[PDB]
Enzyme design. Structure first.
Site, PDB file in Angstrom:
ATOM      1  N   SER A   1      36.894  34.869  56.148  1.00 12.42           N
ATOM      2  CA  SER A   1      35.996  35.427  57.164  1.00 12.42           C
ATOM      3  C   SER A   1      34.930  34.424  57.519  1.00 12.42           C
ATOM      4  O   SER A   1      34.420  33.700  56.666  1.00 12.42           O
ATOM      5  CB  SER A   1      35.309  36.663  56.638  1.00 12.42           C
ATOM      6  OG  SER A   1      36.287  37.600  56.181  1.00 12.42           O
ATOM      7  N   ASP A  76      34.514  39.237  34.944  1.00 12.67           N
ATOM      8  CA  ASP A  76      34.781  38.410  33.781  1.00 12.67           C
ATOM      9  C   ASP A  76      35.891  39.033  32.952  1.00 12.67           C
ATOM     10  O   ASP A  76      36.006  40.264  32.875  1.00 12.67           O
ATOM     11  CB  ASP A  76      33.559  38.253  32.864  1.00 12.67           C
ATOM     12  CG  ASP A  76      32.489  37.350  33.433  1.00 12.67           C
ATOM     13  OD1 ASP A  76      32.635  36.748  34.521  1.00 12.67           O
ATOM     14  OD2 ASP A  76      31.415  37.245  32.771  1.00 12.67           O
TER      15      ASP A  76
END
Ligand SMILES: [Ca+2]
Ligand SMILES: [Ca+2]
Lengths: 526, 195
Positions: A1, A76
């Site tokens: 984008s 994570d």
């Protein structure tokens, strides 16, 4: 984008400008939904992703907004130490802990007959278990910094819709918990940029490019204040451009740094803004066109190629010709005369040269990991490592000497030219490649079918799935936009298509737009 | 132009422009027009998040449904999220879902005229919506841009490099592949622009 915001001093009209270009693929019905919303003190026009009760690309009475994906580090993976005597137990804060277990039933359509299959899923303190390495007594769990705050992110976006000034918009931005870039332009001439999201405070003892041990010594310690997220109001340069690139010099994103290197596709927008003085929406559209058709490796690699060939052109006449063709090429793969072939034949040479060069650079060292490294070294946003090797700039590993790099450039040239000579001929106009086309199909990035699609072919463009161009004039937001394929996805039982199923495809393909409507008097006649 | 308490003006491209006296009415109309235009798409996006696509499209989508359920949330967990919002905001999301449901109810009552072809061809009916389902529509698409397992790919790259080349060389190669910070990478703002 991609996105651009232009402040008053860089805008020809002295009004702030905004450009949107979210890249969410091309499907029918479309990924976006355009709407006008009008209630007391809330007037807003634009589009949002399908199903969202808010506008993401458009403007209210006071401000225009857009967004691009942030690529910030909000996921994570934790490497859980499993009990060798019980694979549903993991070591955490001094004690074996039990995984939460969940059985889920899936009804599957067969043939017609329906069948039931069961699967068992696990969670640890860190999140869902995504992968097992049973051989190593390890399971991998996934922590999202936004876990359980997705509704707070919806609320933040709604508040951005309701906002009337920088303070209110920034408040909304500070509440958004997922990783996006937000862009703002208002009628007072202000522009603002925010890299939004909740970014965790990580252990300084771990390398954040790799999974974190899950035993308890390396846990997140809260989330950093929004004041530490990259952000700027009225930056000195007078504009902000973005194509998913890095927010600011010292902002890191861990495992996903591969998108933020010296060679980065945002260069197309930087080049276009820096090549101009004051700009208007027409200029922004020209920049979008360049970015949409650019052969992105040209920015750094075409000069390197030319420099090498120029050293040997007195002996090799084919190289002199290639240099002339490369120099006159405008770096685009475009079809201005709509004849179905890219206009520059040397672009076909350059594409093949690049593919050959990339393989010669890395196959002998990374071939044994290429199922994972090719997506890094030939990434769609840039090829930084390849650039550094070929240019002789400092690297940690000595991939190739300058002599070896130059030989690669030459071998790749000879091979690409030999194939073109064999199959097309010696004049570059014979090399022109047929255009690649795309359709607005049935399956989006969520990877499941949501309709029947469309078979109408248009040229492939490295472009937003919609575009808005907005000028924040004193009176109101003004400008133009396109939201392909069309507004309405309904197909009648008998096969009759809505007249608004694909009536914006021609606009999109031909770089034409419909007016941005804000004033009700304009809406009623639009 | 056509009028509940909300005037809806459809322009020449079919875009709906909604004129309401308050936000509760506005957000219901917003869900309604979106369902009028996109009901099958909305249904399938919701099924994507719930992991129920294989009920419609078969075994090819089982592993996708499994991933969605593995990483997703229960209805109760989503309801807890909604209960943590400002009261008015939760109510507007509820209104939006009520608007979608208003069209669903209309379509199931007149399916031959108001239920789109895909429902007829695939042989099923749309269900009614709740505010939790609206959150599911947000999650199915937005989370895609946030979620990745690159840490695991990186661990695998390093381990394979190390097993052939040794640790010191593998570390240097990896540092070139996935850098800590490329100081020359183009940036959207400059450090002195930071607030
Ligand atoms: Ca991470
Ligand atoms: Ca042409």
């Amino acid at each position: 984008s991609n996105a651009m915001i232009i402040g008053a001093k860089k805008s020809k009209s002295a009004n702030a400008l905004l450009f949107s270009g979210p890249q969410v693929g091309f499907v029918a019905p479309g990924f976006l939904y355009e709407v006008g919303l009008h209630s007391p003190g809330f007037d807003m026009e634009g589009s949002g992703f399908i199903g969202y009760p808010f506008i993401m690309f458009g403007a209210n009475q006071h401000l225009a907004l857009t967004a691009t994906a942030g690529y910030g580090n909000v996921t994570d993976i934790f490497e859980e130490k499993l009990n060798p005597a019980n694979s549903t137990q993991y070591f955490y804060k001094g004690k074996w802990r039990n995984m939460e277990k969940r059985t889920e039933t899936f009804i599957v359509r067969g043939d017609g007959k329906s069948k039931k299959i069961e699967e068992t899923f696990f969670h640890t303190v860190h999140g869902p278990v995504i992968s097992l390495d049973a051989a190593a007594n390890v399971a991998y769990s996934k922590s999202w910094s936004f876990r359980g705050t997705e509704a707070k992110s919806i609320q933040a976006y709604m508040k951005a819709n309701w906002a009337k000034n920088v303070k209110e918009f920034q408040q909304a931005a500070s509440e958004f918990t997922m990783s996006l870039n937000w862009y703002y332009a208002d009628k007072k001439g202000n522009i603002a940029y925010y890299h939004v999201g909740k970014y965790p405070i990580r252990s300084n003892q771990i390398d954040d490019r790799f999974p974190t041990p899950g035993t308890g010594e390396y846990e997140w310690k809260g989330f950093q204040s929004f004041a530490k997220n990259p952000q700027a109001i009225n930056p000195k340069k007078g504009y902000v451009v973005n194509w998913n690139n890095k927010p600011s010099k010292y902002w890191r994103n861990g495992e996903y740094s591969i998108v933020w290197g010296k060679d980065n596709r945002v260069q197309q927008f930087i080049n276009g803004i820096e090549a101009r003085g004051k700009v208007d929406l027409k200029d922004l559209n020209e920049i979008n066109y360049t970015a949409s058709f650019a052969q992105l490796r040209t920015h750094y690699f075409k000069p390197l190629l030319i420099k090498t060939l120029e050293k040997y052109q007195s002996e090799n006449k084919e190289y002199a010709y290639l240099v002339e063709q490369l120099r006159k090429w405008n770096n685009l793969k475009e079809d201005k005369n709509h004849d179905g072939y890219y206009d520059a034949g040397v672009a076909a040479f350059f594409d093949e040269w690049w593919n050959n060069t990339h393989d010669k650079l890395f196959n002998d060292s990374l071939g044994i990991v290429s199922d994972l490294t090719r997506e890094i070294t030939d990434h769609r946003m840039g090829a930084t490592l390849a650039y550094k090797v070929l240019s002789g700039e400092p690297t940690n590993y000595q991939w190739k000497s300058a002599a070896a790099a130059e030989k690669i450039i030459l071998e790749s040239t000879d091979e690409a030219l030999a194939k073109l000579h064999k199959e097309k001929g010696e004049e570059a106009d014979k090399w022109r490649a047929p255009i690649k086309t795309m359709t607005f199909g049935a399956k989006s990035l969520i990877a499941i079918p949501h309709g029947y699609g469309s078979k109408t072919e248009i040229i492939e463009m490295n472009r937003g799935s919609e575009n808005h161009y907005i000028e924040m004039t004193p009176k109101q937001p003004e400008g133009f936009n396109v939201t392909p394929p069309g507004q309405i996805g309904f197909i009648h039982k008998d096969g009759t298509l809505s007249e608004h199923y694909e009536d914006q495809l021609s606009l999109y393909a031909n770089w034409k737009f419909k007016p941005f409507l804000f004033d009700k008097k304009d809406v009623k006649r639009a | 132009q056509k009028k509940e308490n909300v005037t809806i003006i459809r322009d020449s491209y079919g875009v709906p422009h909604l004129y309401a006296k308050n936000k509760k009415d506005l957000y219901k109309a917003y869900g309604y027009v979106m369902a009028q235009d996109r009901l099958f798409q909305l249904e399938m996006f919701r099924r994507g998040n719930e992991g129920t696509v294989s009920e419609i499209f078969g075994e090819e989508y089982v592993t996708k449904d499994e991933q969605s359920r593995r990483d997703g949330y229960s209805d109760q967990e989503i309801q807890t999220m909604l209960n943590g919002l400002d009261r008015e905001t939760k109510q507007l999301i509820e209104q939006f879902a009520e608007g979608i449901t208003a069209y669903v109810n209309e379509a199931v009552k007149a399916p031959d005229q108001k239920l789109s072809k895909e429902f007829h061809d695939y042989g099923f009916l749309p269900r009614k919506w709740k505010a939790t389902d609206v959150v599911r529509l947000y999650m199915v698409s937005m989370t895609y841009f946030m979620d990745n397992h690159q840490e695991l790919k990186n661990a695998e790259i390093l381990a394979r490099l190390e097993r052939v080349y040794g640790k010191e060389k593998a570390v240097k190669m990896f540092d070139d592949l996935v850098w800590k910070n490329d100081l020359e990478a183009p940036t959207s703002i400059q450090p002195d622009d930071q607030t």
